[PDB]
Each structure stands twice: as C-alpha cells, then as structure tokens.
C-alpha cells in the first residue's frame, strides 16, 4: 500500500509534471531490456531499460526523459509484487511476445493451458480439439512383444524335424528351403555353436575363428551368455557363375542375385515383409537392393541406411529390411546382390509376415510345430 | 518514442479536457469490431471501431464522444508496436475472449501454452497433469501387424495336409472343419484360382465368372496382380429346407442359420472374436445377426454397419464381425441367417482369438503346422 | 458507455482528487480476495475485496482509504462488461497467478492454447515441441491381443496329440514337459472338469471340491458359465524331501525350489519372459523369488506385488512375472520356492516369450499344432 494523493496545493505543478509523464508512459508498458547499470550513453525518450543491478533500487524503471524536457532524470517506479509484462524485440519461436511475470521475487513466464486431463490414471491424447483417452498398447514398445517366426527351422539348418523349444540338439546340419541358391550360387556349412563348449573350459566342441567374430559382434563377451547357449549352425554362400539379374549398388559396381527365397508366401498382411538376419563379408563385396524403389527403409544395427550401401567387408552387420507388396508373393524378395566369388557368411535369418520391431536379435524367434515338442 | 508534455500553459485546458476523454475509455480497452471506413450512422459513447480503412491512419481509434460532448470528433490514437488487446462480443468456443495481440505488423491470436515435449525422440501424452512418454507401439498401425491365423487350411479348402507356405498347391478341392452345415445346408465346390492361368495369357486352368467378379471387387486389375497369385478354393452353401434357430434382420424379415462353426474353441481372449471373411448372394436374401445384442460392431468394406443390414444382391463385401463372450465357446458364432433357398458365394475366410484389425485382406493369414515344411 | 467528463468547474477539485485517488489504484489490480460484505475492521490503503454481496453492488470494489486521507469511504467501481483480473495471494501449482477473467455474467478461468489438433480423425501427440498423429494400436488395450501360446497341450495335461482347438477331449491324464519336478517334487492329477458335467444338472462326471473352489475364484458361476466349459486336467506338487536350491521370502522363512522347466528356450525377444498361472496352497507354505533381482514386477489378480510376499494359504491366485534375461535360457524359470510337504494346487498354466497383459485369463491360450485339425 501507498499513496501519493493530498500534498499542499503549492507544490502541485512538479506532482502534475509527474503524472503527465507517467499518463505518457501507460500507453504499453514494455521494456526493450534488463540493465544492470543505468544506460550512461545512447538512451532517449522511450527507452525503458529495467534496472536489476545489485542494491535496493533492482526492478526499478529507468525511462530516460530527454525530448521535450527541462532536465532529463532517471525516472524510477519501484514496483511492488508486480505482475505480466510484455516484451516487443525478442519473441518466442511461435509469435509470442515475450513476458517475465514478475512473481514478486522473480520473473516469472507467462503461464496458460485450459486442459489437464482427469487423474484418473488414463493417458490422453488430443483429437479433433479434444483430449481422448489412449489405451495400453500405446506405451508397450515393439522390441518385446512376442510375435510369430515363419521358419520351421528357426535357421540353424537341422531340419524341421528339430524341437524349436530345445536349447540343444542333435541332429546334423540341413539346408533351409528359405535359403534357395541363385545364379549358380552354392551354399556349404560354415559352423556351428554347441552349449558347453570347450573353448570357454567346457568339454564340447570347439569355436571358430567366424563365432568369435560373431559373437564379439553380438556383445555376449559374459561367461553367462559366452560360454553358454543355443545351437544353431552357420553357413557360407558361393556366388555362382552365371550373370542373370544385374544390379548397381549406392557406389556404382553392378552385381548379380546369388539368393532367392522360392517365392514364399509371406506378401500377405497389408503386403508388408520383414527380414532380419546377421551376415559378414569374408570376401568380394556386395550391396542392398538395385535403386530407391517403391517404399523401403533399412536399418543397419539400429541406424537408419539407403539402398545401395556397399556394407563394410568381414563385419557383422544386422539388417532389417521392410518394405510392401501387394502382389502376394516374390521370389528375389531381399533385393541383395553380391559380386562373383564373394564370400558372404550369414547366420540366424529370421522373416516376418509384416512390419515388426524386435530390435539386435540375438537369436531366431520361436515357432510351433509337431517336432515342437 | 513520443511525448504530449509541455506545451504552454494557455492551452492546457484543451489537453486536459483531452486526456479525461481518455482516462474514461481506459476503463477496458475492447472494440466493438474492426472497420475500413469510419461509421456514418449509429454510433455514440463507449462504440469503437478499430479504423483499418486504406491509408495513413489504420488502426487509428475511432469513438464517438458525443453524450456529454459539446461537439462529437472521432478522436484518433495511433497504435506503436501495439499488444494484446480483448474482444468482448464474439467468443471462442472454450469461453476465450477473443483476443488479437498487434504483433506491429499483424493482428495476432494470443499465444500460450505451459509444456513443450522435450526434443529428445519420445512421444509425451498427457497423464495425470503431467506428459509421459509414449511406446513405439502408439505410432504403428494395426492393418500390418502379423498375427497368427486359427484356420488349419487357410480356408483354400484343401486340407490340413497343404503346406500353407507354398504358392501353388495340387491337393484337390475338401471340406472345411470350420464351416459346418446348418439346418440342412449344403456346401459345394464353387470355383478355383490357379497360378498362371490361361485366361489371362497362359497355359493353366480358366478362371470362371465368379472369380473375375471378387478380383474387380478385389481391385486386382493389374497383370501383375490379377494374371498371378495364390491358388485356393471357392464354395458355395446353399441353404437347407428346415426351419430351426429363426431370425429377423433389420428389414423385418424372418431367416434361419445354414452354417455353424462346431463351437470353436476361439473365443479365449477376454471373450474376444473377430471374423473375417468375403462373400456374395448369387440367390436370395441374407441379413447379419438377429438384433442388436451385447456388444457388436460391424464394418462392411470399412465401413460400420449395425446388425441385421441385408447386404446388397450379387456384390462382394469386407465384414468383420467382432464381440465379446466370456462363455468361453460358442457354435452359431457368425450369428448369420439367411433365406432358404439362397444361394450364397463365399471365399478365404479369416478367424481371429481377438480383436484384430488386418483391414480388407487380400488372402488369408498363414499359419504353421507339421505341413507347412 | 458512461462518461465523467465535463460537470462545472467549480466543483472540479472533488473529481480530482477523485480521479487522482484512481491513478493511485491502477498500478497493479490485483484483488485481495471476493467478500459478500464489507470488511467492517482490519482493512487500510491497498486492501481491495471484490464486494460481492446479495444486491445490486455486486462486484463493486471495496478499496478503503485511510492513510493519508481526511476521511475514509468504500469507494465503487462499477464494472462493465469486465475482463482479466490478477490474483496474487493464491496460485496454481505451476506458477500461474490466478485469474477471474469476468465474462460478464460469471468470474471465468484465463484461457490460453496455441494448439488444437486437426479434426481429421486422427490422434495427435506432442514430440520435440509439435504435435504428430499417433497410430491406431495407440488406443487398443493388451488384454485382448490374440497372442501365441508356447505350452503344446495348453496345461490341459492330456498331452500334445489332443487337439487344443476342440472343447472336449477323450484323451487321459498325461505329464506336461512344461513343468518338471525339483527336489525330489512328486506332481499327480488333481481333477478334471468336463463339458456338460452332472454337479449342475447334467450327466458327465461330477465336479470336486478343488474345481467349485477355483470356479468361484473365477467368478464363473452362473450356469452359461459354470455348468458348461472346456476340458482339462488339475494337478498337486508335493515338495519332495531334498534341500537344494535354498532361499528366504519376504517374511525371512527358508524355502527350497519344488519345480522347473527343463532349460526351454523362452528367452529370446529381448530376453523378457511371461509366466501366468492360477494355483492355490493346499498345506505348508510358499513364496515368489527369493529377493529382488534385477528387473522384475509382479502382478496379484491384477495388483502389482513384490518379491518373497507369501500368497494366501487355500486361496486361487492369478500370478504374472515378467522379466528380462540376455542369457537365452534359465530352467528355474519361476523363482517359487515352497516349504517341504506343502501341497500346492495350480491349473491352466500359461507362458509368453515376451512382456503380454491378458489380464484375469480364464482358459489357457491356443496354439497350432499336427493335431490342431
């Protein structure tokens, strides 16, 4: 509380004075900045600098008082539990003029919102200018949710005959019919893991050079995940001969399809695919797709690549290639062709009728048959 | 920057005169509405229009002071990086007064709003009075998601012992445990679609009119689409002469059941159901459900539909038909009752434990079993 | 419109210091508070109540002026057609001063918002400062997505060749590979409950104890319900003699683990795992896990619990663990551990290789098999 009304008559002329040159300043109180120190040089009329430097006289108004005056002064107005004040030169990205509500010890932004959604433990979202309740699935991720293999072999290249449930097995090495050789190409098995192994003090079979590479790629370098798990076996395909179906990569070198899918009846839901499955180069080199066709969108361990990346010789790369077709089937569906000679070593495919996001895999994902138990 | 001290004292009736004509209008700066062009005719105190007209002087103030005036000006008040300033008479809908902000050069809406997401790649939706990130799973859809389907044969009506992962099959035409009989009803063989048929330019089977009409319906005009594709079978039901389980459809028209599923272990999750299959009336009359009971939803091509709709003779139609029955079992599932005597075409039927949302397929959802090698 | 213009000279002084008492107030109008009456002690310069008493005066200021003043009055402000007003003493938890916007009839709530969604159907939420449209599995709960089973005989403990699709099966009691006996544990049949059973009215075999026990946990009793249903088998684990495998639950008690799983290869999407099961204590006592262990969240009927809480003795619980492992692998899955001699009942198992919410099952989840036909 204070006021400035009565005074003898005497004196009122210096009090109107002073009224006028505030009815002046009311017409929009906005300040071009905060001063810690009065402006010395270069201020005029309607500059309004608000001094904040250290003393009693912080927050103080410092209106310079020069053009159609007697003797220019700083003017000061100390404010008192003050409120909303607006500022013209800097603005938020969104057209909105600045404000430091002064919350009478600091300043404070200007503060809005006309909905909070009910604590009621739904989550909301906003629809058609309305707030509308969300459902669970909204906030379980992709990367965990359970969804169905279509090999029946899970790729450890056993057969079907093989329990898919079992964390070993016997039987030998098998080729997979989701794994057809092309243009001549030859594919021959290239190793496999065994639980209990005797590289890492065990009494089973030993690891080759290829499954350490591997698995320093998978990050299992723990006893608990490197001295143990699945069996599965890798192989190493050939790249024939024959020259039929020429493509260029991203860097301009034409190759050829070495692998065909036997047009397998995956292209069904929306005619989405997805394939996932870890390679490494040992030799020759080899790239993903022809051109930028249709849609596509591939993922290189997590991170975003176009098509034609020439992927780096002898490391383990995991791709996951999506993309959609409603004509129902194709037989060349992963697009991937690879120069005459090369060496590309591959382990643990895995395909899905659709879109799916399980992230790095670390091994194929289960199915049910009548060996599945 | 400007200035109205001063000036003689000789005068200053006149300017103080001026200054109470405007500590009256500060009472509330809002304006009745915006004007090009000065108003000619009923105006008076407290009425002022934003004079916008072409010129010098837009935006310039425009009240009237003619009650208690002794001559009526339209007194004029240049703006200068003028501020929010209120509306009274039109409103938003929300309650807001309407408000343009001058940002100096445009008639700005006032801008507010307490929380931005934070730029770090996670949806936020509002919980509680707070945002809370959301999962991958809230951004992608449900029509390609790949989940498993119930039918053993894909209903290409071949049997159980047909690998569903091939494209082509050459078992011959057999019944579906799925579609049983009702009321005395038979189902026959209607037709089939072979890959590389003759009628679109190759050297295998014709395809027969029933089929050219589900592929327009289909929309699979295309060669690519339409000379090629996955083989199944066609049936046809035809209705029998008993009278058991009647039904009226939303036309007021009486109908019994002709097909049973043979109580289905389905309905498992939370009750949940859904059914998806494409059809067309070649004879008759056929309607959806009895009436409205429980809960139902029905979506015809995508587009919802209420119970007992009397689908259109002679054209393919999407349904869906999802509900919910904690019974844990049910045999008249489709709840679907048509005429005796009509003559009803139907192809790739699709079941699901739940409600799921693959949108118009295109054929049915694959499975695995001990054949699917 | 109102005006205070004019009025004879000779009179002035009084609407001077009238208009000057004004300019004193406008600094800030911010209101103490709204009264119905007259603060009638304890108010001086600065106090400010809206006098909103029963009467025409309604919302009338209230300002009282005594400090440097001859004699003090309630001086009025009339308003009209009124708008923002700050609030000072009171604030809302974000900071935001409050404020009676007076829409003229009713003291209204400030209104802010720079974003409303597009009315296009789809749902928006906000990411790194703007608004994106969400998919449509952001709004599907989890309690109904028809996932995949991994148990081949669906815990009915009748073994894989029955089929899981049918509601009735002839085959008899058969051990389950799912769950194997630990220290010494001996697993036996515990009952059977059949379709159109003879307790409520039929002529099947009649229901025991056990099962009206679990059917009344269920909420299964109303005859639809209650005296129809699918198969299955019941079983009791009695702890065997051995003490291997110590551990302590939340009440510090030693337990011994009673069964495992034989090494099944659940762990794979993202090493998360799903357990749900309905069991009951017969005899002796039980708990969950042995202490908090990595990541781990346990669900009771819905209610989430923690780690070594002893479950109820001869009450049906509904159990979920769900928990993360990069291993690949673990036969003592569960983490249950029981005292020796108890007599623990479970029925209708269920596993997930993966984090799934399906809520209060009542019947195990289907799956596809060679005898699923």
Known sequence: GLLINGLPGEGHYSDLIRMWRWDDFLRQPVVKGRVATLPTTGQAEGD????????????????????????????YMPPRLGWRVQVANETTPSGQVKTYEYSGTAWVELVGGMSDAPSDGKAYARESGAWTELGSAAKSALNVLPFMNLMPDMGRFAGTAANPLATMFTTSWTPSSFLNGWNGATVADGGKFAFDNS??????????????????????????????????????????????????????????????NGSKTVF???????????????????????????????????????????????????????????????????YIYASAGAQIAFACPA???????????????????????
Chains 1, 2, 3 share one sequence.
């Open 351 to 373: 395909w899905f009728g659709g879109l799916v996001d399980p992230g790095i895999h670390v091994a194929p994902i289960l199915t049910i048959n009548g060996a599945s138990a």
């Open 268 to 334: 069904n839901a929306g005619g989405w695919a997805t394939v996932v499955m870890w390679l490494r180069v040992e030799s020759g080199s080899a790239h993903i797709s022809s051109a930028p066709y249709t849609t596509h969108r591939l993922w290189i361990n997590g991170a975003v690549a176009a098509p034609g990346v020439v992927l780096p010789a002898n490391q383990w790369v995991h791709l996951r290639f999506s993309m959609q077709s409603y004509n129902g089937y194709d037989n060349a569906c992963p």
């Open 48 to 75: 309004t600098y608000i001094f904040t430097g250290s003393g009693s006289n912080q927050n103080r108004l410092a209106r310079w008082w020069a053009t159609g005056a007697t003797t220019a002064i700083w003017e």
């Open 199 to 260: 590289t890492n003090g065990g009494a089973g079979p030993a690891l080759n050079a290829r499954v350490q590479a591997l698995l320093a790629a998978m990050g299992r370098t723990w006893t608990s995940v490197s001295r143990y798990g699945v069996e599965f076996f890798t192989a190493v395909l050939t790249a024939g001969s024959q020259t039929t179906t020429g493509s260029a990569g991203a860097d301009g070198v034409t190759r050829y399809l070495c692998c065909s």
